[PDB]
C-alpha cells in the first residue's frame, strides 16, 4: 500500500511543479503572445483573437497551481492520518489490505471514520462534537460557493447588474437613495482570486474538522 | 490621489466599486505604488517587517495569557495522560442549556475549548511549572511587541 501511495505523492510534485515551472519560464513571452512581458505579472487575458487567450498570464499559472497543491497535500495528510489511526488502535492489518484499492480508502477511511463526527447534533441530542459537526458542513458550504466564481464568468453577471441598477432607479421611496460608487461585477482576475479563496478556505475547514473530530472522538 | 487609495491615482479616479476592491489588494505591492523610489521601497519594507514582528509577539502573548487565566496548566502537569489541556473559555450568548453542559469538560466550571496546538507539552518540557511563570511570560512578550 505504501508503495502505491508514494507515487501518487510523487505524481503531485511533478505536476504541481510543471504548472509553476511552465509559468515561470514562459512569463517573458511565448509563441501565442511573444510580448507577454509588456503587460505585467497579472492581466486578465488577451482577447478572443488568435483562437482565444483565456488564462494566459503567469498569474494564472500560479492560479491553477494551488489546486494541485491542495490535492497533493490532500494525498499526503490523508496517508499520514489513516496509517496512524490504524496503528493507534493496534489494527495495522486494516490499512495494509484496504489501502490497495480505492474503495478501501473511500469505505474504510472516509465513510467509516466519520460516524462519530456527523452525529454532533441530531433530533435526539447534541454532544461535544457538535461544533466540529457544524464546521464540517460549513466547510462544505464555502467550498461549494467557490465553484460559483470559477465556472460562471463575468459577462453574465454584468448584464444582470444593469437590470438591477435600473429597477432601483425607478422604485418609489427607493430612488431617494443613490449609490456613491456605481455598482459593477467583479473583474475577471478578481473572480478567480475570490473563487480560489472560497475553495481553499472550504477545503481546509472541511478536512480540519474531520481530522480533529474523528481522532478526538476515539482519542485513539 | 485625492481619495482612497492614497497610493494609486489610477485607481482613485475609478468611479465604480472596482476602486474599493482594488484599493485593498494592491496595498502592499510597493513597486507599483505611484511616486515610489528605491529608498522608499526598502524603508517601507523595513518598517513593515517590524509590524509583522509585533503581530507575532502579540499573538504569542495571547496564548500564554489564556492558558494561565482559564486553563488547566497547573492541574494538567499533575497527570498529563488524563487531563484534557484547555485552550480558553467560551462565552457565547446564543448557547442553549444542553450545549453549556456538553462543552463543560477538562475539569472547568463552564464551557471551554480543548487545546490541540500542543502548547501544554512544549511549556512543560522547557521548564515552565505554574501559572505565574506564564503571566510574566505574557507581559514580557507584550513588552517585546511594544
Amino acid at each position: 500500500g505504501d508503495f502505491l501511495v508514494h507515487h501518487a505523492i510523487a505524481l503531485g510534485l511533478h505536476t504541481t511543479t510543471l504548472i509553476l515551472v511552465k509559468g515561470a519560464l514562459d512569463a517573458r513571452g511565448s509563441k501565442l503572445m511573444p510580448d507577454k512581458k509588456d503587460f505585467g505579472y497579472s492581466f486578465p487575458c488577451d482577447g478572443p483573437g488568435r483562437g482565444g487567450t483565456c488564462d494566459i498570464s503567469a498569474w494564472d499559472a500560479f492560479y491553477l497551481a494551488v489546486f494541485w497543491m491542495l490535492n497533493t497535500i490532500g494525498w499526503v495528510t490523508f496517508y499520514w492520518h489513516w496509517k496512524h489511526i490504524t496503528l493507534w488502535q493496534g489494527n495495522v492489518s486494516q490499512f495494509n489490505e484496504s489501502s490497495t484499492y480505492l474503495m478501501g480508502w473511500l469505505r474504510d477511511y472516509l465513510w467509516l471514520n466519520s460516524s462519530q463526527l456527523i452525529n454532533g447534533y441530531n433530533p435526539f441530542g447534541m454532544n461535544s462534537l457538535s461544533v466540529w459537526a457544524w464546521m464540517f458542513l460549513f466547510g462544505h458550504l464555502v467550498w461549494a460557493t467557490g465553484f460559483m466564481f470559477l465556472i460562471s464568468w463575468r459577462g453574465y453577471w454584468q448584464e444582470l447588474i444593469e437590470t438591477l441598477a435600473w429597477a432601483h432607479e425607478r422604485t418609489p421611496l427607493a430612488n431617494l437613495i443613490r449609490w456613491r460608487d456605481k455598482p459593477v461585477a467583479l473583474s475577471i482576475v478578481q473572480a478567480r482570486l475570490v473563487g480560489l479563496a472560497h475553495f481553499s478556505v472550504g477545503y481546509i475547514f472541511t478536512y480540519a474538522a474531520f481530522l480533529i473530530a474523528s481522532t478526538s472522538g476515539k482519542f485513539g | 490621489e485625492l481619495r482612497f487609495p492614497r497610493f494609486s491615482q489610477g485607481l482613485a479616479q475609478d468611479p465604480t466599486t472596482r476602486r474599493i476592491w482594488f484599493g485593498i489588494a494592491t496595498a502592499h505591492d510597493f513597486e507599483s505604488h505611484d511616486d515610489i523610489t528605491e529608498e522608499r521601497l526598502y524603508q517601507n519594507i523595513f518598517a513593515s517587517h517590524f509590524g509583522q514582528l509585533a503581530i507575532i509577539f502579540l499573538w504569542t502573548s495571547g496564548n500564554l495569557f489564556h492558558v494561565a487565566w482559564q486553563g488547566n496548566f497547573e492541574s494538567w502537569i499533575q497527570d498529563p495522560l488524563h487531563v484534557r489541556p484547555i485552550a480558553h473559555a467560551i462565552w457565547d450568548p446564543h448557547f442553549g442549556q444542553p450545549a453549556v453542559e456538553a462543552f463543560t469538560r477538562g475539569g472547568a466550571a463552564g464551557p471551554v475549548n480543548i487545546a490541540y496546538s500542543g502548547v501544554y507539552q512544549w511549556w512543560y518540557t522547557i521548564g515552565l511549572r505554574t501559572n505565574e511563570d506564564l503571566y510574566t511570560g505574557a507581559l514580557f512578550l507584550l513588552f517585546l511587541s511594544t
Binding site: - | 485625492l2 481619495r3 482612497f4 474599493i20 484599493g23
Partner: peptide, 30 residues
Amino acid sequence: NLPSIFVPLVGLVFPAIAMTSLFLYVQKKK
C-alpha cells in the same frame, strides 16, 4: 464576569465603529 463585557465590545461595538469609520474614509473626496 469580565467576558460578558469584553465579548460584546469586540463583537458588536468595535465592529460598528470600525465599519462606520472606514466607510467615511473610503467615501471621502478632496
